[PDB]
Design a protein around this ligand. Structure first.
Ligand SMILES: *CCC1=C(C)C(=O)NC1Cc1[nH]c(/C=C2\N=C(C[C@H]3NC(=O)C(CC)=C3C)C(C)=C2CCC(=O)O)c(CCC(=O)O)c1C
Ligand SMILES: *CCC1=C(C)C(=O)NC1Cc1[nH]c(/C=C2\N=C(C[C@H]3NC(=O)C(CC)=C3C)C(C)=C2CCC(=O)O)c(CCC(=O)O)c1C
Ligand SMILES: *CCC1=C(C)C(=O)NC1Cc1[nH]c(/C=C2\N=C(C[C@H]3NC(=O)C(CC)=C3C)C(C)=C2CCC(=O)O)c(CCC(=O)O)c1C
Ligand SMILES: *CCC1=C(C)C(=O)NC1Cc1[nH]c(/C=C2\N=C(C[C@H]3NC(=O)C(CC)=C3C)C(C)=C2CCC(=O)O)c(CCC(=O)O)c1C
Ligand SMILES: *[C@H](C)C1=C(C)C(=O)N[C@H]1Cc1[nH]c(/C=C2\N=C(C[C@H]3NC(=O)C(CC)=C3C)C(C)=C2CCC(=O)O)c(CCC(=O)O)c1C
Ligand SMILES: *[C@H](C)C1=C(C)C(=O)N[C@H]1Cc1[nH]c(/C=C2\N=C(C[C@H]3NC(=O)C(CC)=C3C)C(C)=C2CCC(=O)O)c(CCC(=O)O)c1C
Ligand SMILES: *[C@H](C)C1=C(C)[C@@H](CC2=N/C(=C\c3[nH]c(C[C@@H]4NC(=O)C(C)=C4[C@H](*)C)c(C)c3CCC(=O)O)C(CCC(=O)O)=C2C)NC1=O
Ligand SMILES: *[C@H](C)C1=C(C)[C@@H](CC2=N/C(=C\c3[nH]c(C[C@@H]4NC(=O)C(C)=C4[C@H](*)C)c(C)c3CCC(=O)O)C(CCC(=O)O)=C2C)NC1=O
Ligand SMILES: *[C@H](C)C1=C(C)[C@@H](CC2=N/C(=C\c3[nH]c(C[C@@H]4NC(=O)C(C)=C4[C@H](*)C)c(C)c3CCC(=O)O)C(CCC(=O)O)=C2C)NC1=O
Ligand SMILES: *[C@H](C)C1=C(C)[C@@H](CC2=N/C(=C\c3[nH]c(C[C@@H]4NC(=O)C(C)=C4[C@H](*)C)c(C)c3CCC(=O)O)C(CCC(=O)O)=C2C)NC1=O
Ligand SMILES: CCC1=C(C)[C@@H](CC2=N/C(=C\c3[nH]c(CC4NC(=O)C(C)=C4CC)c(C)c3CCC(=O)O)C(CCC(=O)O)=C2C)NC1=O
Ligand SMILES: CCC1=C(C)[C@@H](CC2=N/C(=C\c3[nH]c(CC4NC(=O)C(C)=C4CC)c(C)c3CCC(=O)O)C(CCC(=O)O)=C2C)NC1=O
Ligand SMILES: CCC1=C(C)[C@@H](CC2=N/C(=C\c3[nH]c(CC4NC(=O)C(C)=C4CC)c(C)c3CCC(=O)O)C(CCC(=O)O)=C2C)NC1=O
Ligand SMILES: CCC1=C(C)[C@@H](CC2=N/C(=C\c3[nH]c(CC4NC(=O)C(C)=C4CC)c(C)c3CCC(=O)O)C(CCC(=O)O)=C2C)NC1=O
Lengths: 176, 164, 164, 176, 164, 176, 176, 164
């Protein structure tokens, strides 16, 4: 996996070039927003259980056929499977967010996921309803606009970070 | 690419864990030491050609026998590649200073290097000569700040220690 | 004991490596964030009894049914152990804030905890009640500084998330 | 393995006690000398090859019987074995030094080493001549008194650190 | 699906063996105990709704606090699911009595159940309340024969012991 | 794998239904013929060696090209391979018969068999001549009409069982 | 592992003798009490959770030093370890009871247990207080004299069985 | 020693499980079929010498060539061992009928038997001759009951099928 700096270095390398001055100033911007980024990550991981059962309960909320016989959240074993998968995806997008790169999300989690699901019978339109709910639960927590819980941070615009985390959730909703 | 962020994330991934305090502190350290390795990195990137050229001249000064027929400097094309290799290494040091870890050096130039040089008759000592020269040549505060000297000197010692 | 220093060293030990820049930057982060987790740790250590006591009162206020015969509060010895358990957890949070990572919580109280509580009929929710109360009760700047609030609140969220 | 803080926490725990105020101030001293400690570690690892072949060449220097037939550095295979062992011990003492605790030196390197050596036939009086040479090569580099190489650091007394690294080398010389 | 027949066959398959006397005796035992577990199974199937309803009423009688806001009974839809879950469990007990082993309970309701309930805040005790009530409520010879009481009570103890 | 009862339970489950009264009486019929079923299984397994070398010798009997150079029973190694495969299939159909379900035959033996054979070069028209001979050797033994050996059982109609065992042999002859 | 019959056969074999008539009548007594034995096993396993946390809570009840710092039930991790060990021993004695032989208790559970415990630091006087409590919890349930729970069985003397289960618990209390 | 009880227990031990209904039903089958395998076992034990002697006579009647010099019957000591081996096998069948499974046959006489006989020149067919004779010789109801005939004949077919 790569992070923000390794990603700049891989791109510089494809041209056999030392790191541009433009790229250095981008990276020092990355560094300037270091602490906002850490607060972003902290606001997701401190609420991970909330985010994952919100999203799965919601998925089932909008389509109760999932928990009728033959649906993929039917037994306790499949419900627990789905909760684990929600948790796993959220973990790899919190890696992405802390990394500044989607490298690890794509490499260690999304690669072959679409196939695995096709094989198992896991409804993909539903996985992405869950992931899209997690997207909003998460950008709420980042932006500190979640209804039932706040997290004291200093006053600033965290919108670039929220958009980042939403772009990683969309990478997931697209891998399948 | 080995680095604070990658090392920490993949420790946590190995464990099934979300990031926690250790992980966030680790990145915070990346923030603190950022500003002097990027200084080294920019000074190196801004003067790479003169550094590469003094280092290669120092190498062939120490080992004039390399210019003999049969040695790795018996032709102008071969000597020029020698300085090219030195530049590759300094580019990778640039990367290493920007990432914050020895990743780029590790994968892109250390990995095959003993086999490759064993096979094309490139004495390990000549590169060590060129990096030692560069290291000792650096001057504080002329060439860069003290804690950037530390970072630069450090990557050079790492690459030196990979040829011992 | 999981922590910045231990996580980094054992990544390097797994690889056969001496410490390098990533490792030294990681410890540097430990230095930067030191001064506010140790603040949380000292405030917690200086007022542990009052925190433990408000948390346990909040728990049994939320779940008065626990005091029924057959529940986990049907005797004074049992209620007193409940507050004891809460104190154990806050001691481990103290450790977690001093080490810099969730190590102490992980090994010394999380590990067997679901099996133990399943077997002695201790509802997971009651501990969650006590830690949520403590978390929301904290007040900045009254009780501690802002970045120490962050550290303290964080260890509490971690222990909460281990019971969901 | 433990470090300086985990070690304070294990000791506090054996009494079921929150971390004393005295211990906190010790730890903030540890933190105050954080940067000297990093320079200490950097001055060993930047010279590791020097330190290890100095010491082994010296061991053989003082007792050439090691490289006569039947000595334990006789073939290339055994010489290279010994160089690896020098390097390994130095690595675990640089872990110790960076950790502030001998936990990892004792756990991952010294445990059973004496037995292993007895089994193989590895002269122990010689291993410790090598380790004691490494001890001096190392405290030289820390204290910046090495003859043929200096390392620009700021002016200060690094003596507590040198004594630390010498105490870890003595733990090794004692394990066998 | 764990059962006498499946357990025996797959012991023999693991060994490369045709069925032998142990295997045929094992099935013969399935024949002997057939006639009272199928009796339990038919009585359960014939009165499932009344059993499910007494069990759920007993649960919410024991834990009236569940009907509070925030608990798992704070809405009519949620209470109704509770009785639904109890019915799922009794359907699986029906299956368990028909197969002759705990297979159906094992795969279809035990497997994910601790994680699922940990995450949707469903106290383990409430289900234990509902199954204990059903177990103690059964009456011989009124409700079924003695050796069918044994089978029924047994599956209930199994499901109870999976929540301790 | 499933047996007769587990199979009724899986079907009941797909409708979220407790086991019908009709299904219970079918199962008590299964139980009523329990002992005939055990005699059926006993009459196959007590003769397994007979059945398998009858069938393979017969396969080769009708087509001697199998044991000419290039045929798949040519060396001792391939002949022994084929005998093992005959024995294995007979074992999985005696599991089927004792189970009351073809679940284990299909899951543990037939799945991918057709592919494996295509890969190896194993003539499939011949495998099924062997399997069809085993079918008759077996329903003979069940029905107690085998020429050169009888097995004292009580007087009854075992025809449903014979048809069962022939349906499992046909599942095999169809998987390839 | 052996059971009651295999045990008679091993003893017969040491003399190269077919099974005595005396031994056959002992075995038919074993068979006569078959159903009481099954009720015995059912009354332990249906209460296993009760028996194991009764016993461990009691062990800690009589010696609270176990749950003071440094005691072997101190952290959650060690408490859960002890509960698992209680459960395991009870499982192997319910195997013994269902088997009619202590073969499996001794072979798969007690062999080296004393050593393992010595190695770990597990107080053995306490393990056996727990095991001796489990002994009484169990013979209560067998004999149907447990205070807070009864199990409807037919009227008979189950005392030989209770003594059997107590002899297996004593084998445990003796292995350490 | 393979048997209903041992097979079931060690399936459960492999799974970490207490005994459950499948296990108890399996033993119940052992109870049902007990009374006719023990009948076979007692009839066999009561007349072992005459059975062994008819079987060995039948063997050497079918293969008179075994009594030639160089064969396995070229001396009275060797013929006597032959009948001894047959007795060993019938003792193991006695055990197999008492245990309820083929355990004793499996470990104590099947295991090394192909190698041993390959090496001492003992044709497999001769033992098959002796067991086939015994099997076909049995007479119901003269020699034993019908379901004991089944058990006895069965162990004999098993031992026969281990020599094909
Ligand atoms: C994500 C944006 C948030 C929105 C909701 C907002 O309105 N204010 C926000 C966050 C934010 N944080 C800072 C600055 C800091 N964040 C800090 C904590 C993180 N740095 C760390 O080392 C750790 C982990 C170990 C973190 C969790 C810290 C320490 C700072 C700097 C000083 C402080 O605020 O206490 C800013 C901008 C303020 C700035 O000076 O950068 C914002 C907007
Ligand atoms: C070991 C003692 C040395 C002896 C030989 C001496 O006479 N001076 C010495 C070392 C020393 N260093 C500092 C302070 C710093 N060391 C720094 C580098 C390390 N901190 C890091 O983050 C990194 C790795 C990533 C290190 C290698 C830094 C940055 C400092 C602080 C500022 C600086 O000196 O550039 C001191 C004391 C000076 C102080 O203010 O603490 C001494 C004595
Ligand atoms: C498969 C049909 C056979 C045909 C060839 C036939 O003409 N008679 C046949 C078989 C048959 N068996 C029974 C009843 C029994 N079979 C028994 C042995 C099996 N039960 C076992 O427990 C064991 C293994 C452990 C078996 C091998 C038994 C014990 C019986 C019941 C009493 C007895 O016959 O000895 C029947 C029907 C007779 C009945 O009462 O069911 C038939 C037709
Ligand atoms: C352990 C002694 C008990 C004491 C507490 C007592 O006062 N009565 C007791 C038990 C007992 N049970 C029987 C007879 C049976 N037990 C049966 C159930 C077990 N047999 C099985 O196949 C199964 C599992 C699959 C069992 C759990 C059964 C079926 C019987 C036989 C008929 C019946 O009682 O329903 C006796 C003696 C009565 C007898 O006829 O043997 C006693 C004393
Ligand atoms: C070097 C200073 C010693 C002098 C004295 C000498 O004469 N020989 C020296 C060292 C030596 N060590 C081996 C072989 C082993 N050393 C082992 C321990 C190290 N391996 C580890 O992983 C670590 C760290 C945890 C330690 C410290 C082990 C194990 C071996 C055996 C494996 C192997 O590579 O042989 C030898 C060779 C002895 C031989 O003839 O094989 C020597 C000469
Ligand atoms: C419980 C009644 C005991 C009291 C006395 C006490 O204070 N601690 C108790 C039990 C305990 N047991 C362990 C760790 C192990 N126990 C082992 C044996 C069991 N494992 C098995 O598979 C079986 C059956 C065959 C047995 C009987 C083994 C092995 C271990 C080591 C593996 C492990 O899980 O640790 C401990 C923990 C000691 C520690 O600090 O690790 C305790 C407290
Ligand atoms: C059924 C229709 C239903 C389910 C059960 C939910 C699905 C859902 N959740 C959405 C957003 C969301 N979830 C959370 C976490 C949650 N909110 C809190 O304040 C805390 C604490 C928790 C733990 C329960 C958050 C923060 C959010 C943010 C957005 C919001 O409006 O609250 C959501 C919206 C998706 C979208 O924007 O399209 C859905 C559908 N919600 C249901 O209604
Ligand atoms: C044979 C008698 C002989 C060998 C070959 C050496 C053994 C030895 N080395 C000692 C100390 C030492 N080694 C180094 C590393 C070395 N010195 C440098 O400046 C650089 C660069 C290198 C790489 C070669 C150092 C720094 C030291 C420090 C102490 C010193 O006096 O230089 C040593 C002393 C051990 C002691 O104090 O008892 C020995 C014996 N030396 C030999 O003489
Ligand atoms: C070559 C043409 C030839 C071979 C060698 C045989 C192939 C064959 N066997 C058939 C049926 C069958 N085999 C057995 C087992 C056998 N019969 C016994 O009585 C005993 C004992 C054994 C061991 C040798 C049985 C029981 C049967 C039953 C049917 C029968 O007629 O005997 C068979 C018929 C297949 C069919 O019905 O199409 C074939 C072709 N037979 C040969 O002729
Ligand atoms: C502290 C001194 C204390 C603990 C907590 C207990 C230890 C203990 N239990 C003994 C026997 C026992 N335990 C059970 C299971 C229990 N009883 C029930 O009726 C049901 C249901 C359960 C689940 C809680 C039983 C059945 C028994 C049988 C004997 C009895 O008197 O009840 C016991 C006695 C050991 C002995 O005989 O020496 C001890 C010490 N008990 C405590 O007092
Ligand atoms: C990261 C890339 C970095 C390097 C490393 C150096 C490398 C370097 N230093 C130079 C130049 C230079 N450097 C020194 C050293 C020196 N002088 C002092 O006052 C102190 C006490 C001493 C520090 C030890 C001297 C004395 C000279 C002039 C001598 C000469 O250039 O021939 C020159 C020649 C170009 C020039 O004149 O500017 C180079 C290429 N430059 C870089 O950008
Ligand atoms: C790490 C351990 C830490 C804790 C966590 C807290 C926990 C705590 N706060 C208290 C005391 C306290 N805290 C607040 C909160 C509060 N007040 C404000 O001005 C702002 C806006 C609010 C922040 C949300 C109030 C209002 C009180 C007084 C109310 C009361 O004590 O009943 C008290 C009672 C003891 C006392 O009065 O001092 C405790 C135990 N104390 C600690 O040492
Ligand atoms: C497998 C599914 C099975 C169950 C389990 C039970 C459960 C059950 N028993 C009932 C009915 C019932 N059961 C008893 C118990 C009782 N009475 C006696 O004579 C003996 C000594 C006692 C045995 C302990 C009483 C006293 C009642 C009437 C009390 C009441 O219904 O309120 C009722 C109410 C419906 C009715 O009245 O018929 C139910 C639902 N029924 C089933 O089909
Ligand atoms: C488990 C150990 C068991 C054996 C197996 C048999 C084996 C056996 N049967 C015998 C005796 C015997 N058995 C039969 C068979 C026979 N007779 C009929 O009426 C029916 C229709 C036939 C069943 C097929 C005959 C005809 C004889 C007398 C012929 C003879 O003994 O030479 C004899 C001779 C001893 C004697 O005369 O009693 C033996 C050894 N005995 C056992 O104890």
């Amino acid at each position: 996996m790569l992070d923000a700096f390794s990603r700049v270095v891989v791109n510089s390398d494809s041209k056999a070039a030392y790191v541009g001055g433009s790229d250095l100033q981008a990276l020092k911007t990355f560094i300037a927003d270091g602490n906002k980024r850490l607060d972003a990550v902290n606001s997701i991981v401190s609420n991970a259980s909330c985010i994952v059962s919100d999203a799965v309960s919601g998925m089932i909320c909008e389509n109760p056929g999932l928990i009728a016989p033959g649906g993929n959240c039917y037994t306790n074993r499949r419900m627990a499977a789905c909760l684990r998968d929600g948790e796993i995806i959220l973990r790899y997008t919190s890696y992405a967010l802390l990394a500044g790169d989607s490298s690890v999300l794509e490499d260690r989690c999304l690669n072959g996921l679409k196939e695995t699901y096709i094989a198992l019978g896991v409804p993909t339109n539903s996985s992405v309803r869950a992931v899209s709910i997690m997207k909003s639960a998460a950008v709420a927590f980042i932006s500190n606009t979640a209804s039932q819980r706040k997290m004291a941070t200093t006053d600033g615009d965290c919108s670039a970070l929220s958009s980042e985390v939403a772009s990683y959730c969309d990478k997931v909703a697209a891998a399948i | 690419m080995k680095s604070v962020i990658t090392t920490t994330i993949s420790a946590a991934d190995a464990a099934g864990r979300f990031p926690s305090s250790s992980d966030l502190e680790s990145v915070q350290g990346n923030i603190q030491r950022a500003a002097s390795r990027l200084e080294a990195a920019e000074k190196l990137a801004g003067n790479h050609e003169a550094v590469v050229k003094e280092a290669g001249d120092a190498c062939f000064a120490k080992y004039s026998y390399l210019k003999n027929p049969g040695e790795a400097g018996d032709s102008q094309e071969k000597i020029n590649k020698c300085y090219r290799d030195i530049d590759h290494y300094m580019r990778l040091i640039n990367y290493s200073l920007v990432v914050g870890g020895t990743g780029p050096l590790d994968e892109w130039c250390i990995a095959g290097a003993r086999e490759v040089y064993r096979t094309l008759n490139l004495p390990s000592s000549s590169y060590v000569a060129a990096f030692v020269f560069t290291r000792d040549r650096l001057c504080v505060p002329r060439d860069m700040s003290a804690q950037a000297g530390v970072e630069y000197g450090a990557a050079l010692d790492y690459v030196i220690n990979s040829l011992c």
